[PDB]
């Protein structure tokens, strides 16, 4: 779940 949230944070 950490990588998913981090990637979503980096995109937006």
């Amino acid at each position: 779940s950490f990588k998913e949230e981090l990637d979503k944070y980096f995109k937006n």
Partner: antibody
Amino acid sequence: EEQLVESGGGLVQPGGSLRLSCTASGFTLSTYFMFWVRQPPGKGLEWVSGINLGGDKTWSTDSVKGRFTTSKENAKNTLYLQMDSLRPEDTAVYYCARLRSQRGFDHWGQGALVTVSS
Amino acid sequence: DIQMTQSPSSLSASVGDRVTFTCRASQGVNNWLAWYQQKPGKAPKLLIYRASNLETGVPSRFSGSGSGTEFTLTISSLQPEDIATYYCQQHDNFPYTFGQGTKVVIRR
């Protein structure tokens, strides 16, 4: 304005414990992901751990998994690193790093030296 | 996982010379790449974000370019304040892997 301050460095016996604090004096510390990265003497950078917005999920590398825990307090604007069962390999300068969404790692601390020796 | 390889590992140039650092990627990372500068002892400073763009505060002599595998950091006019290690770091997929680093020494 945006400044990161670190505290808690010192000398700890092997197998001991130590708590590091990183206070953000410029921004909310909420809307930013945070990371802990150490640099051993004469050695390159080595990312250690990371914490998200709400502190619900954490990451730590396999070498320090289980020994190091990362927490945060947005009310006090402070990121905490609890280190347990220290080893001579953990002797390094520790840094707390911010992460902007689209940029990368922008602001770091001044560095807190942690030495593990008897 | 992605592997970042920099070249050259070290460099020696005189004042005012233009210098170029190349960062090769093991696979496609799009434009998610950053360049950081770190002096001995001090913390790394963000120099280039999104592989082409300039952070606030850093001087205008720093540049950036790269398509998907080969990224380039150029300093147009080398200055005595630029003695440091410059490293590229990817951000497309976690973990953010960094290059081995490039040392810069002035010849005077």
